[PDB]
Amino acid sequence: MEPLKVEKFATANRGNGLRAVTPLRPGELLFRSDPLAYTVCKGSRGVVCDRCLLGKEKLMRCSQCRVAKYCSAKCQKKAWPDHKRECKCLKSCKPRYPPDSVRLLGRVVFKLMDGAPSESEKLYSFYDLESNINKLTEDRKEGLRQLVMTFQHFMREEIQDASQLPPAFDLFEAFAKVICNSFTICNAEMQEVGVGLYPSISLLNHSCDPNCSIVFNGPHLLLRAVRDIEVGEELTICYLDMLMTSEERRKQLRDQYCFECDCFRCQTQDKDADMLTGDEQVWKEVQESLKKIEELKAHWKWEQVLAMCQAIISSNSERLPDINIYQLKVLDCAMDACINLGLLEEALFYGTRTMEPYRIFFPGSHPVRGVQVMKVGKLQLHQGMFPQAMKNLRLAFDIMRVTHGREHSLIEDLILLLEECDANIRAS
């Protein structure tokens, strides 16, 4: 039904890339892709369905390994192909659990042996993926070697030798490819729930100011334009969190992707000054604490996250502004924690404080901001603060119709809320 509006091409210096073959407007869906392979990530193991990656109140463990959990038999049956070979591996590893990259690659090798050409590889295959093999530092090669051994041990029940996989496949190279090509999979409210490989989507080079963005529906990846784009214009996404200083961005791009970004934001340290508002002596502590805090959120430990956040927020109220990114991230965690713990009034407290900083650091239309605004607007609505909510709901609608698309369930809710809210306002 739908014309393909993107194509692979060779760039001057970034290797291959993806570009528009037709003019594109904001919100326009460019690509829908299934994973070559994917898995729930460590922190969400028993929290979301192994298959559809949805959070369901109550999940059924696979009777054999008791590691994989599903929201229904339909999901358990749909997953058995992808699960067959790991089930034994997982059961035996117990009480151990392998790194995600190991479990992920474990699913990949079997997909590689399909005869049904992968829909996820229509533009680019696993074997085309960049490994950056010649640019890896010795520290990295070492860690990769370890992953290789861990794989050999983890898969030993199913694979004993190289001849049981395709001749072109190489473990060391596979892991290198995995580090720089895997996508973290997020639910609709941009919470991290998994990781996957989407080889065709892997063509997109990075920019700290991208013209496209990505949102998932379960393991399905949707790529959209968030900006007007011209024929022949390279399509880009941002590989990184938006709340990072030019220097943090440089380091992670170096360490994980073996390149330095020359985008205009990196040239000019764009917003670095705002991000670091406050005294380094103070906000350094906050940056440190964030390590533990975010590891806790990855494991959905909301009580624990709230406590750490409260101590930090309380203690800094007199000397550190909310626009400082480390402090901002602590507020964002605090809010999410309160929302999950039914502390709604208090969520509104922390949430309102992220609003202006988010508008600044998440320019334009970004799914992360769209969802933030949506949450605050809903919290407002809940507290009866109608004209405030209405303003925010309207704004979330405007952002998310572009980042999530009109057919999205979250847009459905928004419209209903805008209506209930607009009613109470013109009844006031």
Added chain:
Amino acid sequence: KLGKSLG
């Protein structure tokens, strides 16, 4: 963190 971020 394994895998590209989304924001």
